Amino acid sequence: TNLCPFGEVFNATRFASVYAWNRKRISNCVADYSVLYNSASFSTFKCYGVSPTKLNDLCFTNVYADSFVIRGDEVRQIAPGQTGNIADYNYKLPDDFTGCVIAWNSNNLDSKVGGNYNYLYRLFRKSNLKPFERDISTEIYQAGSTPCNGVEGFNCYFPLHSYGFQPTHGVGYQPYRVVVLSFELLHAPATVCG
Amino acid sequence: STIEEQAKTFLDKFNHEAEDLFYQSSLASWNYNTNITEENVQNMNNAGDKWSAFLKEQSTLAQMYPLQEIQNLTVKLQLQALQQNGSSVLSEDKSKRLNTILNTMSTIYSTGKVCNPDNPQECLLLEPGLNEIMANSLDYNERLWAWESWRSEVGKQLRPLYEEYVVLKNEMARANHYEDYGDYWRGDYEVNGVDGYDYSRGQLIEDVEHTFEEIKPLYEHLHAYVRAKLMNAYPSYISPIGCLPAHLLGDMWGRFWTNLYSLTVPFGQKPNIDVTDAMVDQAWDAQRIFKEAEKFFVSVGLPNMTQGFWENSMLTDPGNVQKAVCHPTAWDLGKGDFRILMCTKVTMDDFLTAHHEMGHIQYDMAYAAQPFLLRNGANEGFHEAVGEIMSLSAATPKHLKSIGLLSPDFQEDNETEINFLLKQALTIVGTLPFTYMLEKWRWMVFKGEIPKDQWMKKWWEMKREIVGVVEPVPHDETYCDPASLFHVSNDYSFIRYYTRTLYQFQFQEALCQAAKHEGPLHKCDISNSTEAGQKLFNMLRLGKSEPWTLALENVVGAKNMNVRPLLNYFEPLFTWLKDQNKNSFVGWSTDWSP
Ligand SMILES: *[C@@H]1O[C@H](CO)[C@@H](O)[C@H](O)[C@H]1NC(C)=O
Ligand SMILES: *[C@@H]1O[C@H](CO)[C@@H](O)[C@H](O)[C@H]1NC(C)=O
Ligand SMILES: *[C@@H]1O[C@H](CO)[C@@H](O)[C@H](O)[C@H]1NC(C)=O
Ligand SMILES: *[C@@H]1O[C@H](CO)[C@@H](O)[C@H](O)[C@H]1NC(C)=O
Ligand SMILES: *[C@@H]1O[C@H](CO)[C@@H](O)[C@H](O)[C@H]1NC(C)=O
């Protein structure tokens, strides 16, 4: 009956780092995507497996909103079948992705003079991620054969680095807040519709 | 697992760390350059020291990745560019002495001041005192005084310093398995391990000598005509068959010959093209000039400037309140921050410089996708050549007539393009023999093909066989005349300018042979020709990921410095010079001296 809490997902001030993206679940409510479609301030509103129009008149059992902040030149990697640092190490979208990727420039908040080093991406991983699997584990990355013993050294690297977000960065390096909606269907009755 | 994957991971980490720290260092240096304050100097020096220390540490951690076990070529290029340890390969004492010599050279050059033979207290520096003396005085004796005084004040001061500099840089270079420091510098044009596109470091010397041999007729005709004009401007002070005086070449050291234009113009009555008046008459400003240059670049399909360029670049002097070092410079601060710093006065020269610096920035945007170590010109001469071809295209009367800064009432008759070509040759064909000779002498010094006591004895020897320049007064060996140059004193490679001059005309001929331009080459206008724009962008986007020979062939179709485009560009001028010089002795005799 109530309006699905999309606002607090979008109105929020703190988005996660891409490596530790936030998952929020939306259910048991009537969802209004009209503001999402007609906002026209998003710099990337790409819907996969569903059309922007018909999704409003469509029923789902669960929605997941994955919030994080990335570069602009990496928003393309938030798309099914893409390959890169963000796609493989940090956040993986499945090939059969059935949601909408939304991304807006946020150079004003998420970038400050001297660098905003609060947003981290996982620069290295042993193996590429699976769909919708989070990897916050911060073991030292062993490039070579010698073990690291939890210290920095040859072939041994910290698996997290930070976008030194600054307001004067280029548009591809400017921070971009990305909310990824993923729609799900089960045998249980649908709860996200209207 | 393998060494190659480990090196790939190492360079993956280095890319991000270097991007961050280089952005910080360049941002601090920018904030200083726009606002000269001592706190800004502190920020700049802190960030620069951080960057240098990070480079040293990463070079150390990179040297434990052997190159002989890398099969990838981009990774090999990055590792080679990172593993060169530089002065760190030397011991601490000798390295500190070397850095001391470098800083003493920089200070001696940048602070030396010459004084009149009567007023030793109130006197003048190189800039703008000696600068204006050389660029405006028609007095032979004043120029001779300025020249001899500056050569015997800064050159003599730097001579033992230059001896120590050379003999320690040989140690530094051979410690990196280089034949000399000259070989170390030529290691920029060197390509290895690519079949059909290799380039040895002596191959560069061969190519430069060959291209200069081909130029020598055109340069010699230009030199003869200029000598005739200076005959008519200085009757008794030049021989009719000899060379030119050193001090009397429009500049302190004869690098450019532009300041002879007024004394050598072919047709003084014809109005030289100058749309500065047509700019002030339409109330053009710096923003208008840079918007016009951006529109020109969009015409050839290259992307327009980023919004950050308009927001953050200093396109105009911020009044007299805050002082800035505003030599027009293009700044790729990294991470998408492209800027131009220039005190823009509304002028045709500044219009051309705006096109030049926007060409630099456009080239910088092109390879902004290459890994951090590969974000530079294919070699040292590509970046300024890509910058220069745009000024060439914009200076053409067709572009000016099309942009509304030149009235269609203007008529082009043989006289005006002869004037244009002579201006262009004084700028360009004047500096080629000087640059080639200076780098020849420097490489001979670094290799050791010259005993030290024979430096000047050989240096002013080759002036007579290469450029056609005599010393106004004899010099002993305590002189170090070349150090009077900004680049010889301050440890810079000077052949980048010769290579740049060749590549720019190669690029121009290639582009407006792909632009279907019919007519003389000096009328080459690339505007509205998206085909030439795409042709050049294909070269630009490479950075130095691919060999410079292959990148050059990507536009010209040749793997080497083709001198033919320059001669073709100056063909009308070359014919006119041949016609003009029939009553003069072309060729110079080395024996005559002042
Ligand atoms: C959060 O701010 C946005 C402004 O773009 C807008 O949706 C609204 O003011 C806030 N959200 C809600 C649900 O009110
Ligand atoms: C120039 O630098 C001084 C010292 O840091 C600073 O007070 C001033 O605001 C700067 N000027 C501008 C325009 O920022
Ligand atoms: C060399 O490495 C790059 C990435 O570092 C890779 O894209 C390229 O395919 C490699 N070269 C070859 C021949 O595989
Ligand atoms: C450059 O031109 C493109 C072409 O559509 C345009 O989208 C862009 O806004 C232009 N750049 C600026 C800064 O206006
Ligand atoms: C380029 O083309 C446009 C439109 O065709 C024209 O207005 C402009 O004058 C042309 N400029 C040049 C330099 O050819």
Residue numbers in the entry:
A (entry chain E): 333 to 526
B (entry chain A): 19 to 612
Please share excerpts from the published article on this structure.
Human angiotensin-converting enzyme 2 (hACE2) has been demonstrated as the functional receptor for SARS-CoV-27,8. SARS-CoV-2 cannot infect standard laboratory mice due to inefficient interactions between the receptor-binding domain (RBD) of Spike (S) protein and mouse ACE2 (mACE2). Deep sequencing identified three amino acid substitutions, N501Y, Q493H, and K417N, at the receptor binding domain (RBD) of MASCp36, during in vivo passaging. Cryo-electron microscopy analysis of human ACE2 (hACE2), or mouse ACE2 (mACE2), in complex with the RBD of MASCp36, at 3.1 to 3.7 Å resolution, reveals the molecular basis for the receptor-binding switch.
Specially, single (N501Y), double (Q493H, N501Y), and triple (K417N, Q493H, N501Y) mutations in the RBD were identified in MASCp6, MASCp25, and MASCp36, respectively. Meanwhile, the atomic structures of hACE2 in complex with RBDMACSp6, RBDMACSp25, or RBDMACSp36 were also solved at 3.1–3.7 Å. The same as RBDMACSp36–mACE2 complex, the interaction region could be divided into three patches, the three adaption-mutated residues (K417N, located at PI; Q493H, located at PII; and N501Y, located at PIII) were located at the three patches, respectively. The extensive hydrophobic interactions in PIII were constructed by Y501, T500 in the RBD and Y41, L45 in the hACE2, salt bridge interactions in PII were formed by H493 in the RBD and E35 in the hACE2. However, in PI, the substitution of K with N at residue 417 in RBDMACSp36 loses the salt bridge interaction, which would be formed by K417 in the RBDWT and D30 in the hACE2, structurally explaining the reduced binding affinity of RBDMACSp36 to hACE2. However, the third substitution of K417N significantly reduced binding activity of RBDMACSp36 to hACE2, rendering a lower affinity than that of RBDWT. Interestingly, MASCp36 showed decreased affinity to hACE2 as well as decreased infectivity to primary HAE cells in comparison with WT SARS-CoV-2. These experimental observations were further verified by structural analysis in which MASCp36 loses the key salt bridge interaction with hACE2 when compared to WT SARS-CoV-2. More importantly, Cryo-EM structures of both hACE2 and mACE2 in complex with RBDMASCp25 and RBDMASCp36 define preciously the atomic determinants of the receptor-binding switch: N501Y/Q493H/K417N in MASCp36 formed tight interactions with mACE2 in three patches, respectively, while K417N reduced interaction with hACE2.
